[PDB]
Design a protein around this ligand. Structure first.
Ligand SMILES: O=C(OCc1ccccc1)c1ccccc1
Length: 149
């Protein structure tokens, strides 16, 4: 089988709205771990983001919802699915509705730490594309993640 829980670090993120992912933006997210607790219908997320250019750490809890889905409060309301899982990667698709009501679709490629497999990367690009997110709306997060391990 397939272990979904553990260390996951963000390699790349794509977004329908570039305001949500540049420097210091709420969805420029540097993942550190995700733990799925299906017994209690919960997911545990630990990650860094930057504000004011300095690392801040978050540990959040989402709730398992209908189908394959999870709801979590962060910079508005979020519904995400693990669209793809391999031994080496997860691709997450997330819809965020922010505090103004604006809706953003994002995708995120995660791995076990820095050395990306091209096969996982190609699947990320296809999922991103399928969600209507253009290639130039992809940020390389590996390059930007200087937060603590
Ligand atoms: O890496 C991500 O963590 C998921 C996540 C989802 C919601 C809140 C926190 C973390 C990610 C990437 C792109 C889009 C959405 C999420």
């Amino acid at each position: 089988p397939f272990e979904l829980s553990g260390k996951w670090i963000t390699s790349y993120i794509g977004s329908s709205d570039l305001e949500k992912i540049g420097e210091n933006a709420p969805f420029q997210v540097f993942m550190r771990s995700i733990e799925f607790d299906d017994k209690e219908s919960k997911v545990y997320l630990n990650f860094f983001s930057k504000e004011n250019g300095i690392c801040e750490e978050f540990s959040l809890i989402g709730t398992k919802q209908e189908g394959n889905t999870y709801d979590v409060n962060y910079a508005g309301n979020n519904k995400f699915v693990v669209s793809y899982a391999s031994e080496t990667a997860l691709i997450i698709s997330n819809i965020n509705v922010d505090e103004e009501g604006d809706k953003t679709i994002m995708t995120g490629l995660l791995g076990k730490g820095t050395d990306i497999e091209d096969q996982d990367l190609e699947k990320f690009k296809e999922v991103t594309r399928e969600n209507g997110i253009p290639e130039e709306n992809i940020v390389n997060i590996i390059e930007r993640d200087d937060c603590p391990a």
